[PDB]
Design a protein around this ligand. Structure first.
Ligand SMILES: [Zn+2]
Ligand SMILES: [Zn+2]
Ligand SMILES: [Zn+2]
Ligand SMILES: [Zn+2]
Ligand SMILES: [Zn+2]
Ligand SMILES: [Zn+2]
Ligand SMILES: [Zn+2]
Lengths: 509, 509, 512, 511
């Protein structure tokens, strides 16, 4: 950490050059030189450096990750002047509050909106269902209907959560319920529609913000979904871009996850009070906000000056209209796991292998809890506790009864993994082990592999390798082997039993 | 394997096995085949393990909740009687023995719990559970206990649990949702808390079982007991005026026992499948009455129950409690429910206590690292490589979270950390480095605690607490010996950190 | 009643033409012609005519009012043999079972379901709370979101029973004596949502069955709540009608009352055996039920020939799903008064005099057993009681209702001079004694409170409010003409206390 | 102006110590100048509402808290405004009893609860159950004594047996009583009354016994048990009977639940000297010296004053009175409690007398305790004159559908002279459409008029033989012996459709 020098980290899509302009003011007025940086994977880099203590004095990101930073104790509580707090909008202050207190300054409000090329299409579509027909017409014109980032779930979530997509629910002060709104039938229908667009060649699964932004600038795509920050890039090469309400899906308006752009001061900051004064009386000024808006538009702001200055703009007004229909993203620490699961679900479903139901099912199990410097084996635990395994005291996880000395011995000989529940090591007793072992799933493990991966593993003629039918036990004909590859049906191996389905067994009759 | 020309019947010891044997002696003279009826200990646990071998009984007698799990395992044979025999037996009794749209057992009789009271010791039965604590103190002066019933088995303790709640596995309509189990419900906690408070106030003892409770009531030592119809024969043999009435209400709510249907099942591996089927099919007034004489079978399911058995007031009282209660499900998951509730009731009665914790662990161990590697599923990667006959250098693995194919280095890393393999949907899975790093950073609740009681620490290190030295949790001050005595009196478990087992200043907030 | 011809009554929404064609089969095969007539208010007509002995041989109606008919003796017991009992579904026989004896022949199961036009609205709303927003969007297009019959409580009940609204308690308990759940919070919330839909111009209170049916068929309204009987008329119009589950209210699924079409026999029917054969062996056949379903769909029917035959139809599965969420309607005699009370409350709640809490409050008191003995002639006064019993009042023996003590001769006389009306308990005439009369007279002294609106007050006294004298109850000072007009503008009533009209002055108008 | 000024008039029940209260008042007169007068009026619970309406009556009324709430609704009782120090001097739960509509209405005095008084010499071991008493009476009757004698003419003494197995009364739920949930018809109340009437049928008790007969019997040694409160202990102390206080006997394995009553004092709203009456109650009566004076004449029981109660709690009689109270429940202060007592008293008196069964008497008492049937006009011309309107112009609304009656409907209502309906305190009528529906569902229409045979002969001045009677089922003219069978079996004949009917011997049992 460096004192007398201010280090600011901001996302690349936001205007880092504009923030450098308001920083030069602090360098001449107070004599404190300030550096504005745009690190890649800013949401991932900050927790790693914050644990060591090093990192940026100020960090700019959405408030959802800030709540997890506060639970991690990696950020410092901000202190308003009370009267200065009254100037900013209350709902932005409410979003930067996690379990009380205040974590970050409410800089701006950001929401997704549909951007359409007026020259390519004067009348924007108001429903998702009519978009597939538009792509058929535009591909003949050398254009694409819709191109937007599929790598990040932020852009794809409104379609998923339009019909349902709870993703935790508020219940009179209860939010982070075990129930996750990713397996609801509405979320399945939304992702199925998105996957169907890629399968019907209306969209490409390998599309990121760089490919989609350039296509709209080049005029290749007619529609795209992005936030306020892209407006400046489209302005450089104006394609008659317009901002409209996100399309309705299944009679339901798309619900975007609104994000409050926030600035947080690092907990181990030498210029903590110095950076607090700079954000309070330099960046928050209308002069400072317009400079960052010049490089990349910030959209909706919490400042009272913005309420009359920039709220009149139709693009900003349409962004707020989409925001009111949507719901602000929660600041709970479990949000990072929710983003990772949905990101994994959207990408996997688009590529293949995992169906929409399969990807969302795994997302629910990953988001609710994790199986997971905790000793995995018994000998490691004995050394840290400084007790021999002959003298160690263990308790079964199921019955919470002390293990017998023979039961403790058998656990180490079998080289079993220690199970942790409620932050306490636990083992298994012989009685509970036998009952739960005979529950089911006995020798049920199946090594299912695609034929393409099987060809890479062994090479050689696949026909010479015999894969007898699961029921017929018939040596698979070369045509039956080819059918699995054509229909994308994974071959199954149970112990030493590589098995496939014959044509008669494949179809029910 | 299982012999032919004879029928092997298994029934519990509490049931009247002599009466069933007499029916078989009649079948021996009429059909020419002697049949042997046995009363094995833990027969509900012994039947599944022997049935897979082929050894075991031709007919098994138990409640329908365990039979549904046997049907999914296939250790059960279908029943051929159609509408002619279906109409003779009561319709609702056939509904309980139907699993997956196919009948799985013969509905012999219906059983339900009830309250038995000594009319001479207690002329008028109590109407609510809360009267019993005050009644015990009055009866204690006379030298007699108020109530004694089996606490080792959860079937007897359930009616108090589900009185104000206790949804158990049963949920939804026409189906049961395994995710929602009503064992952590507040009504279930209030019922079990009364039972624990009954034991804490010395009105009941936790070590009491079926034999201890039945002896005291028949010998006149206890005024009330909770038992089914089977105990009436032994109580009638003893010279005690006894009556059967509705179970007491809890918190103004009806006590709900799990209604059970005594059923007859045919082992799938039965050479005499049709022979044993005809013996059960041709369930008659003469056959069921003989078993009822030895030990009452409750309300059977045929004409005999409609006429002679219905006249008994005790049978109607058993049916009255059955109406207040709910019929127990036939789902295979019921075995884990009974095991989890049994362990919860015993630990809450004495030891772990914490009815909230005991029911919480029961919820986790009933709703949804340790298994044998030779059979079942391989524990670690080397065993999986050997069974699949593929070297670790050529094996293909998929991450459980992202399903992306593991890199060869990641496959090597998994084997060296000796990480235990995770199986989802009966398929081997590993973890990729990206998911392993992300999921390890989240959910930080300290590495471990290893909380242990002070009495166990004296046994672990031989030295008493006077010789032992402990440090303060946050002030880092050596604990006074008087502070150690507070922990034992307050039942507080010390915690071990860095091999240092860890004052009054921080003891109270 | 004519002996030979069989008289059958069925409602107009049902298929009367299909029922007549099965009767034409009875006329050709067996030589007995039956006549089916569709009568208006057939639910009310049959109890009237059956007491006189007249009426139809077979009556077709839901099983709710059949229990009250059987208690009155209008219906007759039916025995169809066990083989026919096995042919029909068992739960259908349970609906026609009153006091063990079967009172009618179950025909079909009917339940309400949401009908929506896919062209006007491709995806139906999942929740009731979404309907207000859909109407505003559809209003700009010139269409209305939802229109259904508000005059009959059958269509309004699903919203009432979502968060509560239980007509009677559990089936074993049934009537738990004044356990009617029409004043509960769930019933109050459902009615308040319906009133809010009308007050926010989404729906109209004057809407009836014919108005709502025409709007959906002409494409004017997008959604309507109707049963299977209306499908034929909707199918006649070229409309992409879809049957789906009713929307959710307060996170709770709508609970439609499930009905079963049943056929009962009049007690004074000569051709009892002829009626049984026509119902058992002609109407309740695959061909007989098909004829009635062709004219008007019957929904899920009781015969097991129905299985797979109509169950494959997607509309039928949606009707059963709405039926399984709802509860089967009771067969107790008190159901007739319950339907009248909810109808009165819903009609009152949709219009004025609609505190919603008040409309459901009076419905709770009307559903429970009570009467003020305003009947004509059961004698109402003492002289009429003496005349019917052929005794003089000087010698008549009477008993007090509260204490059951025999009335003194002076107490009997005082009862007649005061012209006190007789009170009937357990069907026995009773009066009152002086001690009980004095005690219960001094129990409540709140006095009469005659509350009238300003417009009705002006009509009654044939004078303007300004010329009429009204005093503020607390101020005891004459009200200003502007103050009296404030009551009219605020729709607040004037009260007559102790023969003096009262109101709230401007100083007392605000909270003080 | 009807009430006197410069003096304080106090009304207290005769069972309480009126003379001891006067001694405290003489101190008030000596210290100041009031000349207070205490009176023990007969039926003061009924007299106070009658006298308070005209403005007259006592300056202070002494009675239990149950009827004081009904006086507050009638406006006869003034509000109580004590300082927080005085409220701390009295016990908290006693203040909660006098709280009606969230405001205090009277000054708590003492707590009262029924107990069992047993002659220790005659009955060394007090019975613990009610079922023991029938066998014990037969033993004492051989000894020339009676087991139990207690007042049966007042429901306060008979209720503890009634509430043991049931006795819902008005029921308690969310801290507010529910008038609709009246529970005197439950099987628990039926069991207690059945045991009570069986004690009278088996000649263990007499149905005509009252307070004076039971008190004199225990004082003279003729009976060995009585159920009475703390006020009677003084007169038993004058008698040589050793006597003692123990818990009430159990019934059906349940403790007898008495109604707890808190003696209280309220000031009439139409009374001067409100501060003078407040001064006497707060600074003279409710003192350690003042409460002792009333206790000497007749024991008040556990007093609300914290200083004196802990001193008199040494008396095992007071602790036994409190033990019975904790098993029971306190009396509701709602005005409907007065109707509850009248219904139970009527049923208990009827059942013990022989008229009506226990099941019949408890049924009518349940309906009497809930809804009810100068002041209200009755008949339309009375309402028209009070409202100064002709019927041609009167506007009336139907009770069921709340719709304004047409003139046609309004004329018909008065031609038929239909007695008016009143709902929610507002005059109402009935419209024709609602009238047809609710008149159709008669549910009975029998109009039975059941009368006994002896009364039938007196009514028509004709013997039963010369009066044709048909059996209800067989429709056979009754034989003269069959008519006597009804009289011997005490079965009343019924006049259905103008025809007297009486069951024949053959139809009495199953055919
Ligand atoms: Zn264990
Ligand atoms: Zn095959
Ligand atoms: Zn991974
Ligand atoms: Zn410390
Ligand atoms: Zn009377
Ligand atoms: Zn009306
Ligand atoms: Zn007869």
């Amino acid at each position: 950490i460096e004192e007398g020098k201010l280090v600011i980290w901001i996302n690349g899509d936001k205007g880092y050059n504009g923030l450098a302009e308001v920083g030069k003011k602090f360098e001449k007025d107070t004599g404190i030189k300030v550096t504005v940086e745009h690190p890649d994977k800013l949401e991932e880099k900050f927790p790693q450096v914050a644990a060591t203590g090093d990192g940026p004095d100020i960090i700019f990101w959405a408030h959802d990750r800030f709540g997890g930073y506060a639970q991690s104790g990696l950020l410092a509580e901000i202190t308003p002047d009370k009267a200065f707090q009254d100037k900013l909008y209350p709902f932005t202050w409410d979003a930067v509050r996690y379990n009380g207190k205040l974590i970050a300054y409410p800089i701006a409000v950001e929401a997704l909106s549909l951007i359409y090329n007026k020259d390519l299409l004067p009348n924007p579509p108001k429903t998702w269902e009519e978009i597939p027909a538009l792509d058929k017409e535009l591909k003949a014109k050398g254009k694409s209907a819709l191109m937007f980032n599929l790598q990040e779930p932020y852009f794809t979530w409104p379609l998923i959560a339009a019909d349902g997509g709870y993703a935790f629910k508020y219940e009179n002060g209860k939010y982070d319920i075990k129930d996750v709104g990713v397996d609801n039938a509405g979320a399945k229908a939304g992702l199925t529609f998105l996957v169907d667009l890629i399968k019907n060649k209306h969209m490409n699964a390998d599309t990121d913000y760089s490919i989609a932004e350039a296509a709209f600038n080049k005029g290749e795509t007619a529609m795209t979904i992005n936030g306020p920050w892209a407006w400046s890039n489209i302005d450089t090469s104006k394609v008659n871009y317009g901002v409209t309400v996100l399309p309705t899906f299944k009679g339901q308006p798309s619900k975007p996850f609104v994000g409050v752009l926030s600035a947080g001061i690092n907990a181990a900051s030498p210029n903590k009070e110095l950076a607090k004064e700079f954000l309070e009386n330099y960046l928050l000024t209308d002069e400072g906000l317009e400079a960052v808006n010049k490089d990349k538009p910030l959209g909706a702001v919490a400042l009272k000056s913005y309420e009359e200055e920039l709220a009149k703009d139709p693009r900003i007004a349409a962004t707020m209209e989409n925001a009111q229909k949507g719901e602000i993203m929660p600041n709970i620490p479990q949000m990072s796991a929710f983003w990772y699961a949905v990101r994994t679900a959207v990408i996997n479903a688009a590529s293949g292998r995992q169906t929409v139901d399969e990807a969302l099912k795994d997302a629910q199990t990953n988001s609710s809890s994790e199986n997971l410097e905790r000793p995995r084996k018994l000998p490691q635990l004995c050394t840290e506790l400084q007790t021999t395994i002959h003298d160690i005291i263990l308790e079964c996880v199921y019955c919470k009864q002390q293990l017998l000395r023979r039961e403790v011995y058998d656990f180490a000989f079998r080289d079993l993994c220690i199970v942790y529940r409620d932050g306490n090591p636990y083992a298994v007793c012989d009685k509970c082990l036998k009952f739960y072992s005979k529950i089911s799933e006995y020798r049920h493990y199946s090594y299912s592999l695609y034929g393409t991966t099987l060809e890479q593993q062994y090479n050689k003629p696949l026909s010479d390798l015999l894969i007898r039918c699961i029921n017929c036990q018939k040596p698979l004909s070369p045509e039956e082997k080819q059918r699995h590859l054509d229909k994308k049906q994974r071959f199954h191996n149970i112990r030493g039993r590589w098995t496939g389905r014959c044509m008669s067994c494949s179809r029910s009759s």
